[PDB]
Amino acid sequence: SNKDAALLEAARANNMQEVSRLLSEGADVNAKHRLGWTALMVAAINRNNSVVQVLLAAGADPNLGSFKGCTALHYAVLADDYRTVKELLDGGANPLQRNEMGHTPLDYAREGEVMKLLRTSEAKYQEKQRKREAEERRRFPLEQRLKEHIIGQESAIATVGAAIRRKENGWYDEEHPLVFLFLGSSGIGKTELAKQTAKYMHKDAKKGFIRLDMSEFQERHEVAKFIGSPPGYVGHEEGGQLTKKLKQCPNAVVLFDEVDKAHPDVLTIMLQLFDEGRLTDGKGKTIDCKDAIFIMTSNVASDEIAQHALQLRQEALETISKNFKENVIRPILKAHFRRDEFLGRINEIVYFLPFCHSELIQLVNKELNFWAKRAKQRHNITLLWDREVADVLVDGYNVHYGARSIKHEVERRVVNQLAAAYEQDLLPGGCTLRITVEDS
Amino acid sequence: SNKDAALLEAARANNMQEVSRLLSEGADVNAKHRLGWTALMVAAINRNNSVVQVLLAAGADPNLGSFKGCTALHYAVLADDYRTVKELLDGGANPLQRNEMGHTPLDYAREGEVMKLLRTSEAKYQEKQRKREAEERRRFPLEQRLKEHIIGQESAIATVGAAIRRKENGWYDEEHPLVFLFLGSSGIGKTELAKQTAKYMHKDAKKGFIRLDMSEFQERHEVAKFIGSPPGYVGHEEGGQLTKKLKQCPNAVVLFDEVDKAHPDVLTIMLQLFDEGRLTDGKGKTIDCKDAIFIMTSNVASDEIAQHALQLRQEALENFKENVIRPILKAHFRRDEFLGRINEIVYFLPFCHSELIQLVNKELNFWAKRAKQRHNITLLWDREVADVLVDGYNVHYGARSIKHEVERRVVNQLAAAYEQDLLPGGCTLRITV
Amino acid sequence: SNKDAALLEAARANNMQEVSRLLSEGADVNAKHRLGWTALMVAAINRNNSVVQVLLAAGADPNLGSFKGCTALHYAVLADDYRTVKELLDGGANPLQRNEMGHTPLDYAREGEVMKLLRTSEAKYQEKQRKREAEERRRFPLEQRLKEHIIGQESAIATVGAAIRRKENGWYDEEHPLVFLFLGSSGIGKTELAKQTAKYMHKDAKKGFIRLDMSEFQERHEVAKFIGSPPGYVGHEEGGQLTKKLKQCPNAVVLFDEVDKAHPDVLTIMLQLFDEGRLTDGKGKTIDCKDAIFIMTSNVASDEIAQHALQLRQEALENFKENVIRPILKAHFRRDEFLGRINEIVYFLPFCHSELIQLVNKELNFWAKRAKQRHNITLLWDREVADVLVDGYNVHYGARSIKHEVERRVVNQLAAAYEQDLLPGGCTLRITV
Ligand SMILES: Nc1ncnc2c1ncn2[C@@H]1O[C@H](COP(=O)(O)OP(=O)(O)OP(O)(O)=S)[C@@H](O)[C@H]1O
Ligand SMILES: Nc1ncnc2c1ncn2[C@@H]1O[C@H](COP(=O)(O)OP(=O)(O)O)[C@@H](O)[C@H]1O
């Protein structure tokens, strides 16, 4: 504890020797004084450029929070010393950091070298971040990330990626959220695509992905879950759940899984959300989510979508459907979703088509790779197969389930055999299996 | 208040006599000083090994939470004293516990004895966890207990054991919960089998088993009873039966009795739950049930199984390609989702004569061993009277029916004799009726 | 604190004047010193027999808890003063109570009169226990006990007595809760039998009785009353109506006064009462009901007995047990859970002419003795007046009909006569109609 006080006193007195001795002895570089200032901070206010430099080289943090709450950069600007401001900025100081009073390094000092340094640091940071992010996106676009997991559905991936890129590059109106409606048969990756998109946007934030299941909303009064009860009713003080989640992460990705299962008057609450990204809870607080992304998944027109997809498979063949027939898909949606204004607010309608033979083979290969890696990681068993296995597994495909049919087929026909053999201790650790078309 | 302050001062001053006197008087061992540290904490920072020893022996907690938020172990490490750290760890201190600033004892530990001791404690905890897992794996197979407590239903026992073992050994996507559909006549061990399974996995916890009878869930408004009402509606505070119980034990075993009677909108929530393993209560709290086990029971095809009896009376009385059960079930549900998601289908067969006499022998043995008027024990039941008790065939009502049968002409006579003081020392049950 | 310290010092020094002054001033007789010894304790260890006497006369407790945890009896016995030990025991001190170290006063006692006195007190306690056991044994036959205050319903009384004996004698599924369903019209002794049973079984005052009207329990009141509004719910009435009383008497006789009016939610939560009991309280407490007695009642089956009268006319007076198995009850209350778990069903028969006239006679006797100027009571033609009263036979809602008959045809006439000053003494009755 004495080391921190000694370092603070040395920094206040501009004692280079004492500051260096304390730092080399393990003294807290960001030591805090009882008055609320640190060694780097009091060095900054006292125009101790050398002390500030040595403290920064020792690991001083200039962004740590009357001048109460003013950081090291704030005090450097207060002294109107440009050398200290430049050194702190080179050390990672934020030129726009704020104190308890809200003052910033860009306000304390008069126009001059300090302002120039702060502005240049801010501009260079912003430009570097912009260029780096753009280059990263170019190098590894969203489409490749989705293709890592999603198989087929090229049109849907292209549409979603185009919309997302248009949003990220700033070429989007901020007055209206972006809304998607995923349509297609069951078990073809709609909610999977939504999950992948949410992960891409908010990879390191669970709060960034808000999931709803509209099976849990199959009656009119279920709207009270979204915004909570009005004043004087049970649960009022709680407030809306969806409103809470949106307030936590305004730019999150909201997924209304199986929206078709909602009562139609539950969708009415979505009008303001989809138009202006505005929603009011039971307490009257209004949530602004203009930059959020809304995804709705349903299979309302599944049969018609499959029939259309046959168009590609109806070709004389001597892949991409124009799908102007959406004019006759609209009546189905209107019949289910009874309000035209609801559909009008949807930016894009994404159609997922049934898998082709090659896509089915790819799915089977994906499943067998997953199982092989699981076996290697768990029991250290190598697992291998040929075309005959993929084709035999595909032959058991069911249209009504898609990827789920493939999963069940692989599990039943192959995984059961691996489990039975393992339980019989016929699989020594490190051994290799070929599935030599093990059938019938 | 004076006792706590005196204990804190004595611990800070390494005064064994004062600390011992305060502990004997009844001073709080975990007393907290106004500066944020306890007596154990200050004894630790001051390298008061003996004070730490006496405090821990009296019940001091070293895991209680600049050095703000530092625990007793944190303070001992900060003092770089091996003795205090060792004593606190022996008292249950966690070497990886984080203070309010996110610094663990390992972080504060300088390389040397303290670091090695903290790593040794961490290794001890990890090895204890690994040994617990190894014992859990190596313990008796579930099928053993099933056979111990279940009579007959060998096919069901084998299927359930195989499924559970496969799940345990991997070989099963953990992203989706196991879903079982139990078919067959009622009162033949379905619920007993589920309880035993719940016993295998949660022998030490009753909460591991949950029941719902879908005779409660036959109309649209009963969906709100399943997962809670919306906020501002009747019963919102209750939050629904299913979620209220699952939130206590996500990896429990859930038994849905007579899913046939479930209203379609309830069938929709169950299928959603099975597919995802994810459910929201009415209060907005979400529950993850990926590793849970869901068991559905019904008698939709009980008659077909009983009459066909493709194993009972035909192959084994303890694949048959019972291909009619699939269309029978399809006729009763949304076959696309309902039957697609089911992981396994388990058949229960009616009891046989051998199973019935085994059950009667087990009931008579339960009555005989529990004879608290001990000296009348060895009231031995010969053989043929147990066969006559089986001859009161009540399989329609299930095993408990046979239990009642036995109790009637096996317990009433014992109670009458005892009340009459007629039969000290016990007797053979011999022949009656 | 000053009064407590002064009283403790006076007791230590055997200062009778100071002790009396402090006691008269309101000083805590059981004042406890910071070292763990009270005024009575220090008076006892110092052989201050007079101080102990005056403290006990003032309400000192000699059972108040290394001598840590030692009672005043322990200290008096340690001092080896016969008078002090005798005085403390006279106040209720237990000669076998253990201190925090597990040492009883007998262990501290030295050979002499102290041994004899402590053993005499222990023998007194043992004799009290044996006397209670003998009284409970003499309570049998419980059928006579009930008949002392009940008329008719011999079959139900005998059934209840036999069940009680079986459970006591180990001839019952004691692991499972004990539950009766009582069936018949209203006002035919159901509540009267439940109350008499509670009065007899429980020592006195029916402290262990718990009766509730399930008609007030609905979806808006189920948890708020049955479980009792738990914390965080609308209302804080934890326990509410049932489990607030079960906290004291786990083996309560608990009456539910109409399951026909009980809500499905409360009938489901009542499923906890069976299996193991352990019904959840609003405070979270659960009571093992394996020993409890539950008495559900209903009038929905009231016709099953009254419409026949064979269960009454053909029960060895001059029909069969479960003539029809749960005729209406299974369809109404979901026998699978609610009634399947009920151990026994008790029928209640319509009152006979002899029973009705006996009720009339007892009520008339009560009114006669209830008279303040009993000299005017002659009860001439009391039997004939009862014959007239029974004309309004109880066939509507129970014995309350006969009570109203008596009130109308007797009490009003007597009140009118008294108002007319026609009741000087030695007054006969009057035969109306
Ligand atoms: N196109 C796909 N490519 C690779 N995996 C897929 C694909 N589609 C689905 N899957 C996988 O198969 C499962 C199906 O999940 P979903 O994506 O959610 O199905 P779904 O289309 O969204 O439709 P529902 O809700 O049954 S209507 C997931 O396990 C996916 O991981
Ligand atoms: N070995 C056994 N086999 C079958 N049932 C048993 C066995 N032991 C006890 N039982 C009884 O079987 C019942 C188990 O639940 P059960 O009634 O058979 O399922 P369900 O009612 O849904 O058809 C219990 O009442 C239990 O007492």
Ligand SMILES: [Mg+2]
């Ligand atoms: Mg989906």
